[PDB]
Amino acid sequence: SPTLSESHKSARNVLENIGIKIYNQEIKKKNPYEQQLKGTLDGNSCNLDHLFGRKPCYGREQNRFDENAEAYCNSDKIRGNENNANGAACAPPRRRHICDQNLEFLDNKNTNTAHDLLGNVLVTAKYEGNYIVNDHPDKNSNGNKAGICTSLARSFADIGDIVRGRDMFLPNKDDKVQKGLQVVFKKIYKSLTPEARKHYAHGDGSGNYAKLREDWWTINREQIWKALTCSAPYYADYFRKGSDGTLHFSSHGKCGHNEGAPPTYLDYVPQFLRWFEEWSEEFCRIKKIKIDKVKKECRDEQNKKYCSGDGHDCTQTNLAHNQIFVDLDCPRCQDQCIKYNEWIVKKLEEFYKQNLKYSMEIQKWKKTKNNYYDKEFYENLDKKSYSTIDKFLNLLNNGKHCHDNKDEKNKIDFNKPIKTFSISEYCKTCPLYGVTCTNRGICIHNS
Numbered sequence: 001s002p003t004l005s006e007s008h009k010s011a012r013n014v015l016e017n018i019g020i021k022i023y024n025q026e027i028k029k030k031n032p033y034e035q036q037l038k039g040t041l042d043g044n045s046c047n048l049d050h051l052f053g054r055k056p057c058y059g060r061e062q063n064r065f066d067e068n069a070e071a072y073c074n075s076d077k078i079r080g081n082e083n084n085a086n087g088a089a090c091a092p093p094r095r096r097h098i099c100d101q102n103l104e105f106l107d108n109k110n111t112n113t114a115h116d117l118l119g120n121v122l123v124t125a126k127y128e129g130n131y132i133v134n135d136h137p138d139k140n141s142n143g144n145k146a147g148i149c150t151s152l153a154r155s156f157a158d159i160g161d162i163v164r165g166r167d168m169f170l171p172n173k174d175d176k177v178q179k180g181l182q183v184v185f186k187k188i189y190k191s192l193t194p195e196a197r198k199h200y201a202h203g204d205g206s207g208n209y210a211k212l213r214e215d216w217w218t219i220n221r222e223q224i225w226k227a228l229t230c231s232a233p234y235y236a237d238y239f240r241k242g243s244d245g246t247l248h249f250s251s252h253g254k255c256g257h258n259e260g261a262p263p264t265y266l267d268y269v270p271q272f273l274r275w276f277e278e279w280s281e282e283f284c285r286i287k288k289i290k291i292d293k294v295k296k297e298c299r300d301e302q303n304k305k306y307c308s309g310d311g312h313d314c315t316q317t318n319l320a321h322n323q324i325f326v327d328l329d330c331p332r333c334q335d336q337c338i339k340y341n342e343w344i345v346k347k348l349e350e351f352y353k354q355n356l357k358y359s360m361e362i363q364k365w366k367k368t369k370n371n372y373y374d375k376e377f378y379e380n381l382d383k384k385s386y387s388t389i390d391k392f393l394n395l396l397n398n399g400k401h402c403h404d405n406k407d408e409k410n411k412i413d414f415n416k417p418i419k420t421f422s423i424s425e426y427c428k429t430c431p432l433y434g435v436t437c438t439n440r441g442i443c444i445h446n447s
């Protein structure tokens, strides 16, 4: 079972465990004004009227999970990414095409209360969840589709960052979702009782919109998770492990849709860390798909096919005597190897960029005297071994998709980029003295 065997030291598990502590600190202090921010309105029913302008997925590209769906690591669309810095956060394709379109229509005479905003956010969650569930790579698995619940937790976390104004992705120069949200949140603040207005106020009397949006999220996150999981398959639950290996899980399917408190705390994990963890999992998952396509064009021992990356037929090639034989099937190995190497080269660059950004986020924590929303989280990473990039890279190695390689040669190790981002073994130059393939269906190295 990949679900049950996932390391208690996977980045997802370690980050979720710090996320729990952050969430706990945040809900420790009583907020007397909670109710003023409280909003009142395989797969199953998604009617919002039963269990509680424009639509959410319009204009958005689908195929978010395709092997060639690209991450965005450049500067114009990411806050904090600049052309003068190699260090960069990578917005995953799941984020890039998120179903947030309805939130671009919040600046209107109708959207004025916490209930009006919740309505819109539940509509976003329902649709985003519907897309994830209906296009997920595990949609047709015969096991409990835990993988879908994980992708939903990742979108739930991005939605929370959009709602809170912490999200780093800038879809275009207009920033309509954010501008709409700041208008709705100004109305909500004005609509509060004077005593609540002072609780959400800076020293100078001006509105503390950052704190107001944080508490709004915290207060409504449970209903938002319920909407997000409306279409979640019945036989799908969220699973996570504690530091001691204790298994934590939703109990009634649909990723905890019917259970109240969300089973996830990813919405309390810094966005950059969540994106890098998804980058690594999706890299390892996609790499397996790409290696298999390279193998079908390069090596088929049973059918006497043994090619090299140079398109040589290893069954008729002897590099030691300088005897090269290029048949008509092996040039296709060359073409698949060229294509695989371009993807690997692009992933290596994305990897170094996030590697640098990680160091920068850790350094920002060490040097920052003043407070910020991500400070306590980075304090906790430091308390554990994770101030070292090497210790954080071990967590990426431990991921569900990344750790799953029983073969010693092709084991994922982010601390050894040369081995992790190398050419496929099926692309290596012919063994020196050639290969002999028997009728048995196995090819042996000559001499």
Ligand code: PRO
Residues within 6 Å of the ligand: 084, 085, 086, 087, 088, 356, 360
């Ligand atoms: O991101 C960059 O290019 C440099 C190197 C690490 C800190 N800033």
Ligand SMILES: [Mg+2]
Residues within 6 Å of the ligand: 075, 076, 077, 078, 079, 080, 081, 082
């Ligand atoms: Mg930028």
